[PDB]
Amino acid sequence: GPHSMRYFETAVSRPGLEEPRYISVGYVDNKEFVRFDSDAENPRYEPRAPWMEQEGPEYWERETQKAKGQEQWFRVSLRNLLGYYNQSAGGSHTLQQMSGCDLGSDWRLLRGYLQFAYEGRDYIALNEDLKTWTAADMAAQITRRKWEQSGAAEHYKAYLEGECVEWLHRYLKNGNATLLRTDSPKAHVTHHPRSKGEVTLRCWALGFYPADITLTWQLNGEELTQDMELVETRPAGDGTFQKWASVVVPLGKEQNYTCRVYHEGLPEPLTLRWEPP
Amino acid sequence: ASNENMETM
């Protein structure tokens, strides 16, 4: 099974203030479990998953101190980046970080991740070997030259191969409830008259997790392309997703068209058409 | 878990 642990860090510079806005979000198999926000009344690591309550007071204090340190790392790095690009402090600048690891067949390290971005675009990233850095621009070349000399990659490799794998094994064992939860989609076809002789059949998909879904419209085996027009996968708000795929069909011949839904957790792919009411 | 970064950019 492909298991993963990720840490999504954000640092937005605040003009006129010493410390930037620091947000650190933790994920286990694309599910939020921990969160830190500097904008909060009491800045500390808070549990976002129910199974995360099993952790002692010593754990939360240790993680909060890591965030307070990272808050200062991003603060100084932000100031150095202004000099590299000849930017002003009066403007707001964003620095983002993505760090984590992937699990193979059964609870063993596959690939280590450590990426950085400045102003939405790729800045510096750690390669698969976890020893070499890939710099996207001339300013990042300075960062690469610094980190190769100080040996930063060795410290990140030690975490990614050690601590990251060790803690993910603990979380996957502790979290069996919300972590393994899979939701099958509920599908139905709606009728909408388009213009005079043409009609639009909309195939809905509701209450499904994860978001990875496939909707295909077909006329007795032969599928329809480009004339389909589909919508982007949107969250319902209760920890589940929504999606629909329309089709331009003639009036009276709507029964000849069938919608097929493909999703993991569904034992057999859903086959459906119009009722009618 | 989180990791602490070493040298700054």
């Epitope: 200062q72 150095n80 202004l82 402090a89 | 040298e7």
Partner: T-cell receptor, first 113, second 112 residues
Framework: QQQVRQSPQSLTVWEGETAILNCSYE??????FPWYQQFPGEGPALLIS?????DKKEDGRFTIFFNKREKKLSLHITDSQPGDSATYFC????????????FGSGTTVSVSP | TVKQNPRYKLARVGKPVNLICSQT?????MYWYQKKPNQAPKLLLF???????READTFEKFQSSRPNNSFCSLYIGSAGLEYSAMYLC????????????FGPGTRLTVLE
């Protein structure tokens, strides 16, 4: 330019006189201005500091005179004594790098007894 | 109360140089400066807790290590003429406007 500019390079005053140590900056972003005193064989030590909001700040015989409009600072030593004969450095700090101090060349004062 | 030993140091060209700095005040920030005659102290690098920051113009010439909050080291590899200057170590309770406490300094001279 930041930079920091300090005038003059060296100053000689008599015992009891007032020693005027001028300093100038270019960047409007600078808000904190600490003055460091260094004696031979010893490292620099904080003497007196001023903020951009204030215009005087007195500490016994040592008084600063800040002017935001002309971007100039001056350190006045009311009653000079040979014990004040040291190298004076004027530092500058901005909100976006409060940890970093931008020091000036330094004025070497010599109080004649 | 920043301690720096030795007060003076002499090294040969191409030999490694290591300068030590003591705390006892339990300060979060420890700075390293370079002081040349008739020149202002130039900031080389600083350490906030375990985080290292080296200045863009300075980096390639200086390395640093902080095993604990009390000790901070400045490493030169290899030494060569340009390094001949006084090296001042500073300490601060925060990463901001608060006071910087300087040590006596280490006057380094590198000869052929």
């Amino acid at each position: 330019q930041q930079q920091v500019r300090q005038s003059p390079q060296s100053l000689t005053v008599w015992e009891g006189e007032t020693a005027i140590l001028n300093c100038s900056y270019e960047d409007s972003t600078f808000n904190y201005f600490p003055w460091y005193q260094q004696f031979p064989g010893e490292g620099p030590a904080l003497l007196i500091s001023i903020r951009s909001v204030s215009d005087k700040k007195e500490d016994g015989r040592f008084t600063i005179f800040f002017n935001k409009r002309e971007k100039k600072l001056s350190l006045h030593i009311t009653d000079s004594q040979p014990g004040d004969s040291a190298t004076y450095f004027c530092a500058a700090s901005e909100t976006s790098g409060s940890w970093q101090l931008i020091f000036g060349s330094g004025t070497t004062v010599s109080v004649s007894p | 109360t920043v301690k720096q030993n030795p007060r003076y140091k002499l090294a040969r060209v191409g030999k490694p140089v290591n300068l030590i700095c003591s705390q006892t005040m339990n300060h979060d920030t420890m700075y390293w400066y370079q002081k040349k005659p008739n020149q202002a102290p130039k900031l080389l690098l600083f350490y906030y807790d375990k985080i290292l920051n080296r200045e863009a113009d300075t980096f390639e010439k200086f390395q640093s290590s902080r095993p604990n909050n009390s000790f901070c080291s400045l490493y030169i590899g290899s030494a060569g003429l340009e390094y001949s200057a006084m090296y001042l170590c500073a300490s601060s309770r925060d990463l901001g406007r608060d006071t910087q406490y300087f040590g006596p300094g280490t006057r380094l001279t590198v000869l052929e």
